[PDB]
Homo-oligomer: 297 residues x 2
Amino acid sequence: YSDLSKGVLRCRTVEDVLTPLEDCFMLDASTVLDFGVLASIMQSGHTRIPVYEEERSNIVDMLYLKDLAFVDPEDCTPLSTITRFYNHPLHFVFNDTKLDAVLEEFKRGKSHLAIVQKVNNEGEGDPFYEVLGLVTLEDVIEEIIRSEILDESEDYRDTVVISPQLLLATQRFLSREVDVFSPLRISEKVLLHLLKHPSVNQEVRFDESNRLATHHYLYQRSQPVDYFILILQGRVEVEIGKEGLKFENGAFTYYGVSALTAYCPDYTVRALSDLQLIKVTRLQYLNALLATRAQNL
Amino acid sequence: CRTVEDVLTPLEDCFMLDASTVLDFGVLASIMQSGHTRIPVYEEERSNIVDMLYLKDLAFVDPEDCTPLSTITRFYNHPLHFVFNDTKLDAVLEEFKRGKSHLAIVQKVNNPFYEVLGLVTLEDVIEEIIRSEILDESEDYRDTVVKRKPASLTISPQLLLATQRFLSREVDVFSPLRISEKVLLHLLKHPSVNQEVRFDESNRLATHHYLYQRSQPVDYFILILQGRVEVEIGKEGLKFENGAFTYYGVSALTVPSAYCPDYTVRALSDLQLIKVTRLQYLNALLATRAQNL
């Protein structure tokens, strides 16, 4: 009987949990559903997305994620033609209405998201309803759990402390093929500068006597790592997976991208010859991003 | 939505700290990354919880002090909250409220002994209660129903699991955050995904030997399981030979912060590979999002 959990929230209104309209995830009905939009929508984590038409506050329809099933980007179908196809309801709620009412509203007409409205009597003539955000069940549950019995543990945030031409080719390859080096994150100028930096361009001397010298290992499996490596010239032996599948890789095969976005690889890379490579630590990546966001503005 | 047992989380999946644990730098970083306001402290075995550690008590500890958790816990002495598995949700909510504890440790009988099942947090109970009685009709899937007119228009499981793990751990677009391990494995098990290519030895440059042609649109990802290929990179045409576990066309699946490669891949042998179209990726994203978690 959740009627008990309903007795300790009758003093809270929507204002407490309201997420303001400016901070709400929405879609302009005129959006075109290409791969980018579809991927970003399906990854946003929302199953229910409002759709407005002109101003951000003129919500008209609602998009369920399943509405997008069987939708091909090639068709470049607009979101309007998907929402004007289905007939999903818009659940409304008032600025001042209590939370038990909001919950029995989510129940009646199954939903987890309601358009919070407030009346505007300031003005001669008839009044109007001014949308001022959304109320989502996540926030209501959070408020109930925080205000039923509160713990003074708001301390979450406790903090505890090679040929220049081939390098240009590498810059172009990375900008066009690897995402973390996309021009949107690191300008092509800054990336070119990074790849030609001495602390990035590295070489390895292969002691043939100690054929398995510790310095021949660019990556060691299940061992913390902090850098990205692309092989410019030479050959390496890669041992992949728990099984230890051994392959031989050469130039233009990059490793450890997840180290820039702890991270421990799923493989071990060892040097088989004299190597020319480019190593990029996470800190170097952060400084490149900072420089790029300073350059843009 | 009946008893504690139905919503608790098991000892296996819980985060705790040993009582003799030194509070070095690593433990502090680990806890702060876990983001848990409560950490149990077991005496000898995890099944035996002896103390409770509130995050409030652990904020201002100096990593350089290398204090032992014993000092913190014994200084704050936070009482414990036990409970059985048969107790309903309303009873445990009243227990949490009248008591001053945010979580309890559940006890069932494996008979004769009281085995600790796990920890029930108030978050879990409130979640279950004010979630199980309000559904969202957008999380159910009735898309089998055809609403618009219908137009009339394999290999070793061991290395396959290895491929799934490799992609999940190394390539981002296949990260578990985007495609669940189940859905990714299911995708790798598929005729149009697991593909082979036959190398016409007479016409070494057959149009079908070209998986990617530089500056020519493509819309799919390829990882090489078996065979050899020639990669011609850049306007310069740097030619290299690549083999197994060298993936291509990742940018066709990523969404930035209309894809043409910076290279041309040609087949040199009979190829066994994994092909992933943009539509296949989008349907994988939906499929993973169908499973609530």
